[PDB]
Each structure stands twice: as C-alpha cells, then as structure tokens.
Amino acid sequence: TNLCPFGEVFNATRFASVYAWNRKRISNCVADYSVLYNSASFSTFKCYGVSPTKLNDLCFTNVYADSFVIRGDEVRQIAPGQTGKIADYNYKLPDDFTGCVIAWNSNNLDSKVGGNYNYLYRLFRKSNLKPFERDISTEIYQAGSTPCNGVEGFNCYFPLQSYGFQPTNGVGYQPYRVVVLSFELLHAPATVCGP
Amino acid sequence: EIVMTQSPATLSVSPGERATLSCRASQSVSSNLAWYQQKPGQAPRLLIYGASTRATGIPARFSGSGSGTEFTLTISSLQSEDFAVYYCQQYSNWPPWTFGQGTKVEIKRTVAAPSVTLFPPSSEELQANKATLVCLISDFYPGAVTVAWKADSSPVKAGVETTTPSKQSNNKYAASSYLSLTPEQWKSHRSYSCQVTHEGSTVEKTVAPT
Amino acid sequence: EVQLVQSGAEVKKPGSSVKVSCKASGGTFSSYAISWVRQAPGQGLEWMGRIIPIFGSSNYAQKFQGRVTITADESTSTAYMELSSLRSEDTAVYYCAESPLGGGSGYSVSWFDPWGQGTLVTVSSASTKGPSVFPLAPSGGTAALGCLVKDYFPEPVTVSWNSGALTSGVHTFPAVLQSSGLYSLSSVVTVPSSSLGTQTYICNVNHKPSNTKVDKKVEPKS
Ligand SMILES: *[C@@H]1O[C@H](CO)[C@@H](O)[C@H](O)[C@H]1NC(C)=O
C-alpha cells in the first residue's frame, strides 16, 4: 500500500539531456494514474494502446518513466513511427508502443537570461536508434569522406550539440519536459497496481 | 579555411561620434558571428553573438549587424569606456575558433611634441667602467617617434635600446632610449647627441664629458 | 553569475613547463566547454584547446598538439592548462573561457563568455638579478633629476621618492628589454631649480624579486 513515487519524476528539480534520457524504474507500489491525468496542466498527455481513464484498473510487473528535455516543435517526435533528429538519434519509441507520452512547457525553469546551453542533443549518428536504445558516445562523427582521427575538423563534427533556451524564444524553441511511461508486463507477479 | 579580415587597423574618433568597424569573412558564414571588446590591459568580454544579438549587460550604443560575408559593429554614441580593441569571430565553418586581426578604437587627440631630456653617464657609473646615456621622451602624440644617436657628428647605433611608445596618464605617450657605451667612447669623442624625430620635427639633445 | 578566477603570474625558463588553473565560482562546470586562448604581446588571440568537463574529452589545435594538456576537476570545478617545452615565443597572456556547444556548427564550441581574468606567462633565458641604481644628476625655472635602475630581472621595480613625501612631478618610465634580456628603467622628477642646493632628493628603489632595497641620493653636478 505504498504510493508510487510520481513526484520523484514529474516534480523533480532537474531533468536529463535528451541524448542521455533518464529511466526511473517503478515497482512494488500502488499507482493512481487519474491524479496525473487530472493535474490538468500538461500540454501533451497522449496514451497509446490504453486509456488513462481506465488505467487504474490494471496491473504490470514494472513501470518505466523515461524523462528528458527537448524543444517545443520536437514534442511531436515523441510518438510511435516518427522521424527527426530526436526520434532517429536521441530517443526512438517503437511502432507497437503501449504507454503514454506526457509533456509540459518548462520555459520558466529551463531558461536563464542570456541563454541556457546546458541541455544537449545528438545531431549525428551513423544509423538510427532501435526502440528505447541509448547513446552517449562522444566519438567524432565522420560526415565527409576523410578520416577524422578522433579530432574535430572540416566535415569531422562533434556528435553532440547545445540547445539555446532563452526566455524570449518562440514556442517551437521553448524548453519542454517530457516523461514517457512504458508498462512492462512480465511473466512474474504484478507489482504495480491501482485501487 | 575561413579567414576573417577586419578594417580599419585603427580608428581615431572623438567622443559622441559614430564609429563603424568592419569584419569580412572569406566564405559565407551565415549569421553566426561574435564581437568581443578588449579594453587595454583587460581580458576580452563578448559584446555580441549571432551577428546581431547583444550580450547580457552590454550597453545599448553597441549594435551588431550583417550576415553572409559582410558584418559591421556600430558604436553610435561613443563614450569613454569604449576605447579598446575589438575582435570578430565566426563560429560556423571550420575552424570555428579563428579570430579577426582586431581593430583599435582610440581617442582622437591633438598632436603633441616629444619633450626630450638627456642625461650624461653619472659619476658612479663611470666609476665601474660602464656608460649609459638616458634619453627620456614624454608628453607626445601620436604614439610613434624615432631615435638616432651620433658620436660628435658621426651617427652610430652600436648598443642602443629603445622602448616602444607607452601611453601615459594623460592620453599622451612616453618612451626612452638607452645607449650603452664604454668610458673611453664617452671621453674619447667630444660630445654625444640624441635625435628624436616626431612627425617631422627633429628635436635633439647633446651632452659632453665634464 | 558564473565568473572565472585564474592563477597568478608565472616566470619560467626555456624548456621548463607551466600549469595554469581556472576556477569557476559557479559551482558546476556543467556542459559548457572550457577553452584556453593565448594572446602574445601586441598580437591577436589564438585558441589553443578545449576540454568538456562532463565528458572528460579534450581537443587541441594542431600547432599545440603534444605540448598542451587541458584537464578538468569537477568536484572543485577547476580547469587546468599545462604547456611544456616553453620557448620565448610562448611569452603571452593565457585566458580561459566557457563556451556553449555549437548550435548546429558540428563543433564543440561557439562563442566565448565568460572570460578568465588572464594569466601572464613570461619565458626568458634570463635569471633573477637585482638592479643597479645611479643618480641622474641635474645640470626655464625648473630642472629634472632622477634615478636610473639598470640591469634587473624580472619586473616590476617600484620607485618612490623621499620615503613617499615627493609624488608631484614624478614620472617613472616603463622599462626597456635589452638584448641581454635585462630591464632598465629610470624615474625622473622635475623640481624647482632654485631648491637644488637646499632640498634633499632621495629615491627609494624596491625590486621584490631579489629583495633589493636601495636608497640613492640625487645631488647636482658641476
Ligand atoms: C507536484 O507538486 C504540486 C504542488 O507543488 C502538487 O499539487 C502536485 O500534486 C505534485 N505532483 C505529483 C505528481 O506529485
């Protein structure tokens, strides 16, 4: 009868950069998803393969919460079967996704005067990411025809890049915080339930 | 690679006037350009990034503009805290850490003449078999002169050191020149003369062993 | 906000090494890239290298590959730059500077803000020496006398007058750099030429790098 730690993920002080999304594991507790859905302050709350209204009546072995920060016009990439810098090089959701994508505009916490360049993303990779794969490799990317020898150069780029989060950007370039709930139902007793 | 060339080298401007500094990229570098100000004897500080956006805290009288290959910085109502060296840096193409040659923005001052003072080798120095002639130039503008030494009426430059002109506390410049001779060379010829040429004027001093 | 405090000045011999620090009072280095740019005397800026603290990876400019080692320590939030095999051409002021990563550059650096206070590094084959002070004697209605502080290393030598009681009319000239790599300056004071027989003029020369304290009296010459 322990209540699952959702404030730990949603009401957290800092979030992870998208290239290194943070996976919190949740198990052995009882969850109320209608509280989250009725916080009513989320600009994105889309559940695939299930409904949040009838969500408290289910039980799963584990619930994974992947949290990170992206920019406004990129929120549309956190969905099954999409393309872009994010979904191809930073955080791919599978097509057969059973979960929820939650997101809210965090322009007040993640924008200092003069910029907030602490949030990063991956701009280069040799191949797309497999669903829920993670990459934090800071190896020099060969974008040209010539070898890079691990040192930057012409057409020899550094694979990570910075977000310019200023309090005056458009919504497309304002920072958004994202939590992706996946529900794993294993061949074991269910440890995450509701009332 | 991408070479940033700036203009002019120096810009003599009186306060209140408008100063316009140019930065030209050898290649098209979008609008990813930075302007840094380096007050004399200070670390640079970034004025402007993204060609036009002013940095947090930078005064209003600075305005960056341009894109592609042509960039300018305008200091509109030139104040006194702004006489400094200004550098531009492109950060799009390879390599993104090249700097421009820099443009100096100094105050326009009316010409001044080099006050010259020459001293003979002191008695204590001749006591120890060394001779130094000190030729001190001060209170002149602009910061550039020339020094020539002559033994009697025979110009020579054997063992001559000369400061670079260094700006004083009053917007005028100063410098010095040291001629290291031997006591014989001091006493064998009848006199020695230091000649300072500034904008044409050949001021001069002379000393004799007594 | 985030401000950078560097180490103190350094004088080194040719061949010896030098290592400069750069502490960020901002607690966390975070994901900015800390880079080192040197300015030779009277010359432009020259980027040397970067290190990214959160990743531990550094990158050096080709001209400095093999001599520069840029490192970072996150607990104390202090970045270090070690340059070895010093030459005279390495005499310069070394600045550290934070930089965001490229917003699409492909490269690990954009613009530079903020900047360190700067660290002067002087490299000369000369060795610590104390100066010699000689009276530049006097000989309109005003005269000029002074002191000559010759053949010392390194700077700075401070020259006061009359234990601090004579400041008006004082002009202490910047020093020279003789071909022997030894400095020489002089401090001249212009005083009423009518007081040359009555007033006492004594110059006090202090060269701290050699514990040299010299009092020299300046009297007129026939
Ligand atoms: C987050 O905090 C707010 C108030 O600080 C609270 O009303 C809300 O229920 C919290 N959310 C969660 C998921 O605990």
Author numbering:
A (entry chain C): 333 to 527
B (entry chain B): 1 to 210
C (entry chain A): 1 to 139, 145 to 227
Quoted from the paper:
Out of a panel of fully human SARS-CoV-2 RBD binding mAbs, three mAbs, MW01, MW05 and MW07, with high neutralization potency against SARS-CoV-2, were selected as lead mAbs. To understand the underlying mechanisms of ADE of SARS-CoV-2 infection on FcγRIIB-expressing immune cells mediated by MW01 and MW05, we solved the crystal structures of MW01 and MW05 Fab in complex with SARS-CoV-2 RBD at a resolution of 2.4 Å and 3.2 Å, respectively. X-ray crystal structure determination and S trimer-binding modeling showed that MW01 and MW05 could bind to RBDs in S trimer with both “up” and “down” states. Blocking endosome transportation and lysosome acidification could inhibit the ADE activity mediated by MW05. Together, our results identified a novel ADE mechanism of SARS-CoV-2 pseudovirus in vitro, FcγRIIB-mediated uptake of SARS-CoV-2/mAb complex with bivalent interaction.
